[PDB]
Structures are given as C-alpha cells and as structure tokens.
Amino acid sequence: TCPFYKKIPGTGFTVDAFQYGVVEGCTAYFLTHFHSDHYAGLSKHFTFPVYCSEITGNLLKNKLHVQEQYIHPLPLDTECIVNGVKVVLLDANHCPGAVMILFYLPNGTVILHTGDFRADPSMERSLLADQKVHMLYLDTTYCSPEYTFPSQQEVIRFAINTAFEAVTLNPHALVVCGTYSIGKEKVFLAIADVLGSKVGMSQEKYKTLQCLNIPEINSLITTDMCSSLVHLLPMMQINFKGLQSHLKKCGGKYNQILAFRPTGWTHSNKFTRIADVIPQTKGNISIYGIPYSEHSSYLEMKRFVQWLKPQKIIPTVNVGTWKSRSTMEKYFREWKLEAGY
Ligand code: NI
C-alpha cells in the first residue's frame, strides 16, 4: 500500500504514486517528472486524472501511450485550482519538465513537495518567498557531507574544451556521449555546438527529444548518424568493447573515439577537482567520467532548507531502512539548531 510520504494531507492527492494500483481516496495523481521510478506502473491502461507539466504531458502521450483524456498539463509559475485546491508548479532544476509542487491547504497549511531537485539560490526569489511553508517533502538523494560536486557550468566548460582540442588535433575523431533517460542534455548539446555539428541518435531517442520543447531542436539533432560527429549511445555501451564495435559500424569515417560518461557522484569527488580529471585509455579510444549532477549536493540542500525554515521535513529518498532515516534526522536537527528555527 501507498506510503504516507506520497500522500498530501487533507486532500485526495498523491505524488509519484502509480505502482500500488488504485489508491483508495485519491482523486488526482501528480507526476513530478518522467523518470521510470517515479512513473512506475503508469501505462496506456491508466484511467485516472494525471496532473503534470506540459513536457511531462508530451512524454506520457507519446512514449507511454497514456490516453489524452487523462493528461492534465499545467503551466509553470501560475496559481491554478485542482479539485478545489490552490496549487503552483515550479521548475525543479532537475531534468526537462521536472517540477516542484506548492499546495495551499484549505486549513491554511502550506506544503512544498520538491520531486527530484537540484537546489539553487534562484529558488529563494520565486513564489516560495511570499509565504511561510509548514511541511517539506524533500529529495534527500545526497543528504550526507561527503557528497560534493562541481557546478554544471564548470563541468560543461571542461567537456567543451576537451572535445574541441581532440577534434582539432584529429578531425577524424568521433565524440560519443552516454545516456539512459532524460536529463543531462546540455552535455551533448554544448559539445555539438562547439564542433558545429548536429547530435546523431537512434529513432527512439530522437522521438524522446522531440517532446521536450527545446527551442530550434530540429537544427540540433538528427537520426542520420553518418552526417554528425557527436553520437548518443546507451550508457551500457560506453566501454572499450562497445565503443570499438560502434567504430566498426560507422564505416571507416572515423579512426578514434572520445567518450563521456555523465555520472552522479562516485568516490573520486573527495580529492580530485574538475581540472585534474584525466581519461581511461585503450588504443584509439578514451573515456572521460564527468560528474554532472541533477540532484542537490549536501551544501546546496542545506542552504535551501535553512532559508526555507520548514516546521517539519518528510524525506522521499533512502527511506527504506531505519539507519538511513535516523542519519537523516540527525542532519535535519543540526540544521535547525544552527539556524534558529
Ligand atoms: Ni529523477
């Protein structure tokens, strides 16, 4: 049965709660974003109202084949009424179409659900600043002090300069970027822009990108692999065997590959800066691991919460074990005592 952390008190609303069949009481199911864990259980067979962003709506319609009658897209940054209750969607700074949801309860309680988010100081000057928030449903993916990582901009700069240097040294080099869902599109779009190229990709991947309301998208991407010197491939193929295999398939038009694996955090964040990063190499193939995160670091998450001063915090990530919940509670109390709420 549907856990209390996916339920919104004193409404019949739920959030990211599609895997438990019919939730008793629920009149409206909210989807923060189009990642499989959050959408899990939704399909063309679902027949209840789904509320979400316009991008998330495009994806449900075209990829999942959810029938149009059940998709209720809502605009960003606008007060809307859903089943008699005032709501706002805000940009989560996660993947394309990802939202936080602000719920104004009839009794006067205000609740923020972050979905998945990368906390940022621009969120301190949104509609969030206009009133007190009593309860926060928080993306605790990286809620521990060892989780640091560079800015997205630092990582992109590094990728751009690296790719440009390699292709100017060898204009028969191919650049490859690994991918498994939506998110992190700026990595491959910024590399292509510096090389003057479109990004080549499979039919299924192109169809996904064509849903994302990216301006001038037709001028940036293509299914013609031949005509393009940046290719997307599944993350599972970003290894020496997979990359040599792909290189054979391209028909002798390239003689070298530079590949990037965008990742979350891995243990080598604790010593290395972005400038010190060096690839793994076997013959004419090099693989760079670059820590491009679309979740809050510890410092970013702490800042956000200390600004917001919630009366109660409800974690939505790593809640399955008592040790994790206990550890997280410890950090929330520290934050509260330091800040004075
Ligand atoms: Ni996500």
Task: List descriptors.
2 domains, monomer, 7-stranded mixed β-sheet, DNA cross-link repair 1A protein, Rossmann fold, 341 residues, alpha/beta, 6-stranded mixed β-sheet, 8 helices
Reconstruct the topology from this structure.
Layout: E1 7-8, E2 13-15, E3 28-30, H1 36-39, E4 50-52, H2 54-64, E5 71-73, E6 80-82, E7 85-91, E8 99-104, E9 110-113, E10 135-138, H3 152-169, E11 173-179, H4 185-195, E12 199-200, H5 203-209, E13 221-222, E14 230-234, H6 240-249, E15 256-263, E16 280-282, E17 285-291, H7 298-308, E18 312-315, H8 322-339
Parallel strand pairs: 2-3, 3-4, 4-5, 9-10, 10-18, 11-14, 11-15, 12-13, 12-14, 15-17
Antiparallel strand pairs: 1-2, 6-7, 7-8, 8-9, 16-17
Helix pairs in contact: 3-4
Residues 33, 35, 94, 116 line the site of nickel (II) ion.
Commentary on this structure:
It is a single chain. This protein is α/β, with parallel strands linked by helices. The chain has two domains: 193 residues, Metallo-beta-lactamase, Chain A (4-Layer Sandwich), CATH 3.60.15.10; 148 residues, Rossmann fold (3-Layer(aba) Sandwich). Helices cover 26% and strands 22% of the residues. The structure holds nickel (II) ion. One of its GO terms (biological process) is double-strand break repair via nonhomologous end joining. Its main location: nucleus. It is found in: Nucleus. It comes from Homo sapiens (Human).
